[PDB]
UniProtKB/Swiss-Prot annotation, chain A:
The modification Phosphoserine is found at S8, S41. The chain holds residues 160 to 211 of 211 of the full protein. This is Troponin I, cardiac muscle. The lineage of its organism: Eukaryota, Metazoa, Chordata, Craniata, Vertebrata. Phosphorylation by STK4/MST1 alters its binding affinity to TNNC1 (cardiac Tn-C) and TNNT2 (cardiac Tn-T). It comes from Mus musculus. Interacts with TRIM63. Binds to actin and tropomyosin. Interacts with STK4/MST1. Signal peptide: none annotated.
Curated annotation (Swiss-Prot), chain B:
Induction: Induced in stimulated quiescent cells. It comes from Mus musculus. This is Tropomyosin alpha-1 chain. The gene is Tpm1. It is found in: Cytoplasm, Cytoskeleton. The molecule is in a coiled coil structure that is formed by 2 polypeptide chains. The sequence exhibits a prominent seven-residues periodicity. Homodimer. Heterodimer of an alpha (TPM1, TPM3 or TPM4) and a beta (TPM2) chain. Interacts with HRG (via the HRR domain); the interaction contributes to the antiangiogenic properties of the histidine/proline-rich region (HRR) of HRG. Interacts (via N-terminus) with LMOD2 (via N-terminus) and TMOD1 (via N-terminus). Belongs to the tropomyosin family. The sequences of cardiac and skeletal muscles are identical. The chain holds residues 64 to 114 of 284 of the full protein. The lineage of its organism: Eukaryota, Metazoa, Chordata, Craniata, Vertebrata.
C-alpha cells in the first residue's frame, strides 16, 4: 500500500511539476496597457485634413 | 465722407477681430468638449473594470 501511494504521488507530483514549470515560466505575458488620460489641454492644430 | 471713411474702416476691423476671436474660441470649445467626452469614455471603461 505504501509503495502504491508513493508511486501515485510521484506521478502526480511529476505532472504538477511539469505543468508548474511553464506556469511560472512565461507569466509576464499579462503585461498590457492601461490607457490613462491627460485631458489633452494642449492640442492647437489646424484644419488641413486631406488625408481623411 | 472722411468721417464715414474712418467709421467704416474701424467698424470693419472690429468686425473681423470679433469674427476671428469667436472662430478660434469655437475651435477651443470643440477641443475641450472632445477632452470631456473621451474622458467620459475612459470613465465608463474604468467602471466596467471595477465592477
Amino acid at each position: 500500500l505504501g509503495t502504491r501511494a508513493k508511486e501515485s504521488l510521484d506521478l502526480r507530483a511529476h505532472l504538477k511539476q511539469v505543468k508548474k514549470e511553464d506556469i511560472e515560466k512565461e507569466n509576464r505575458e499579462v503585461g498590457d496597457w492601461r490607457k490613462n488620460i491627460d485631458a489633452l489641454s494642449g492640442m492647437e492644430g489646424r484644419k488641413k485634413k486631406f488625408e481623411g | 465722407l472722411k468721417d464715414a471713411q474712418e467709421k467704416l474702416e474701424l467698424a470693419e476691423k472690429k468686425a473681423t477681430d470679433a469674427e476671428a476671436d469667436v472662430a478660434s474660441l469655437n475651435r477651443r470649445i470643440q477641443l475641450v468638449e472632445e477632452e470631456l467626452d473621451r474622458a467620459q469614455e475612459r470613465l465608463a471603461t474604468a467602471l466596467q473594470k471595477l465592477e
